[model samples]
Target: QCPAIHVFGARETTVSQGYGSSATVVNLVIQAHPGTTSEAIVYPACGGQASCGGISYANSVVNGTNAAAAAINNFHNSCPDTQLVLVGYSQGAQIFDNALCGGGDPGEGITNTAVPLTAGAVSAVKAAIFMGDPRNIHGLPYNVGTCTTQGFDARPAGFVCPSASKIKSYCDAADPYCCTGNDPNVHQGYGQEYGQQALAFINSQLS
Candidate 1:
């Protein structure tokens, strides 16, 4: 049999922690390709709780991060040959960063270590797409859009994503969460802003 395909979406909400909302862009991108199995990873994408961190906010990111980490591991462990596309937005993006890259954003009470994945799982990851990432450090090889600066909780200047070659993080100057802009709309516009580029990137990798 051919290798299984896994596409997971970890979502973020403009309001408070919304586990019910859809990961709009990832859903769109994943569905564009047939025979691709995608599932949304639900977590408390919390905001306005404690400057985005309160009693619940702290736990939420940690919970979200661990949840994403576990979901990938659980599936990949069983099917080592599966290809993966990890998609996230804002808080969800931060979750991906912590789970995959490790030791990020100390204020969120995260474990500060990358979740362990078998070599097969790491190699099988085809692509990763992040929108409005809190850890948006500028000028990385996989970055897209016009943002010249970093996000509020930007990663260390030297921090690097392990899967940088296959990643596309869409954050611009106007996105409040991922950059030093005032428009929350910019954060929301990534689905439209770079959807085509994202889809093309994924298709290229899968091919």
Candidate 2:
């Protein structure tokens, strides 16, 4: 079975949570695609506890990337024809970004790490969807759906992409993490409104 891996945003752990999370979107994708296995990238250590601090966040990002890369490589080795789809939100998006891109230093005694995507494995990726990514910015000319002149100017610096066209980022105009400013309300509304777009993107990408 093809694996459609879904990674949740910061503060979210499983495929079950209240509204405005990637889990809802993941469920929809699974229900529509019967032959696919649904997997969640779980990192309970960095579940949005303010006290966990940046070090926790950095480690979690590395750990999540390692897990995802291992899964993708394993699946490709065993099921070479399987299609892979990756979806993430918020801090989860950060992890996804670091995995695809190869530069991240967690700092404060944490070693730098990233998922080393094989050329073949990169070819195996069908689609990547991210919401409210803090590292998003307007038209580094690498990412799509970015607005000009009204976005966070420095967020996209040092960011990486596996295949720019295969990735779609949805950032509300008001999300401080990606857009002009931060709004918790806007950051949480992605799954509610963008699920259809995300699904369509994945569906079109898969063979």
Candidate 3:
């Protein structure tokens, strides 16, 4: 069976925008691996449930907390396994970092109850993918690499890294959407070097 997937989109980003959230992007890339052995449900930010007009693949949206919460809730409701690969773009990515790795309020500790960590319950979530996310309310290790700007994809671009700390890691990754994909899948975006590098990183983590 296909690994259950719980995808979440960036904050304020709609599916109609033609770009998947950092979480969605991560899911697509990870799904490429057949033997990875995972399963999930997904959701998007800002009222992502179908009732809210969101186009998420997960079984349902939490409708609370950050996008990460939505994904976590979906994961809990549907899948029983942990060992997950959480993906997020722009704000979506940041939510995951805060909820899981960052260990701050946005981190999984606080939200685990209200939003709750999807993987917290599962115990299998191994790693996560955080794309061009922005700073948090706390202002610590804010790193949302390529999920923001559009020029990476050949588009004009959206938000730039407010702090230098977050920019470096994303820049080094050469994340297409944040640093490199077409604004609208521009002809020049996909073939960029960062896209490959990003994919490689995900594969390495999954492995």
Candidate 4:
């Protein structure tokens, strides 16, 4: 089986589609892999909006996180040869974190037993790209952009993703959502600022 790509967006997005900056990098990456299929049917990507048939913001995050892991697990079981690329932004980023990494999910609070994709599924992921992630933390080997501090809901120091080598996170120094910085515009610039670099990074990982 060939690789399939999954994309997610911020708080305002619906399940069928993705948001702006996230869409920017995803579009370019999809263009790069002309024969590969881009998929999102298994994940809701509601970003905590009641508009997507959710109870509230927090409820949706919990459900969406579980949804992503389920999707990956099911897909991996069906086709072990299929690879995956996960791209997310804002609220969407935290769900990807829990689905791919497990434990110490940001904003989940207290007990750190969050469910993650199966090891087999994790191994199937070729790359994980993040923009304006709320779980952003600095100094990770795969981190990109100017943010030096942790994000609004930064993961604990003890938590680590086994697939960190395949991850590339983008968050600006002035983006309030991902870092302490207060400017929203900075958050919107990552796709334009780093889309090409992200494409290159993804290509390298897939190779």
Q: In model 1, which regions exceed 4 Å deviation?
A: 1-3, 14-22, 48-55
Off by over 4 Å in 2: 1-20, 45-55, 105-115, 140-160
Best by lDDT: 1
Q: What are the per-residue Cα lDDT tens digits for candidate 3 across 11-95?
A: 3234433235343444456567654443222334432455446544221122323445555656655655533555545434445
Answer with 1 or 3, whichever has the higher lDDT: 1
Question: 1-207, model 1: which lDDT tens digit per residue?
Answer: 434567888777434444222256566655786666777776766664554454365677778877888888888887777788888877777787777777656877664555455566677778888888888878777778888898877877766777778788888998887888898888877777787788788878874
Assess every candidate by TM-score.
0.86, 0.75, 0.47, 0.83
Which model is ahead, 2 or 4, in terms of TM-score? 4
Q: After superposition, how far is residue 164 of candidate 4 from its true place, in Å?
A: 1.0
The residue pairs in collision within model 2 are: 176-181, 176-182
- Cα deviation at 74, candidate 1, in Å, is 0.3
Give candidates' CA RMSD values in order: 3.1, 4.4, 9.3, 3.1
> What lDDT score goes with residue 201 in model 3?
53
Better of 3 and 4 by TM-score: 4
Q: What local lDDT does model 3 show for residue 89? A: 51
Model 2 scores worst on lDDT over the 10 consecutive residues at: 11-20
Model 1 TM-score, 2 decimals: 0.86
Could you give candidate 4's per-residue lDDT for residues 18-119 as a string of tens digits? 454467767887687765655442344554566666545466567768776776788778777776777777666667776776665547542456447787
Enumerate residue pairs that collide in model 4: none
